[PDB]
Homo-oligomer: A and B are copies of this chain.
């Protein structure tokens, strides 16, 4: 779990939420962000572990973009 992954994931979720007109001043925005973030980490857990093990890897932006879109699509259908 490198910092670059963290920052890229955070940006993708912020952008995904904003793109959906979901404002950070609503009651479940924080819960929505957190579970998306945690789920996205868990999705890429194996590579994050390898990165931590010095594989010198980098989670690709494109794959993370798919993960976030899948999760936000799932988590915001009722919204």
Contact = CB atoms under 8 A, between A and B. Distances in A.
A75 B77 CA distance: 19
A35 B28 contact: no
Interface residues of A, number: 19
A67 B74 contact: yes
Number of copies: 2
A45 interface: yes
22 contacts: A28-B45, A31-B42, A35-B38, A35-B39, A35-B42, A39-B39, A39-B71, A39-B74, A39-B75, A42-B75, A43-B74, A43-B75, A43-B77, A44-B78, A45-B78, A46-B78, A46-B79, A47-B78, A67-B74, A70-B70, A70-B74, A71-B74
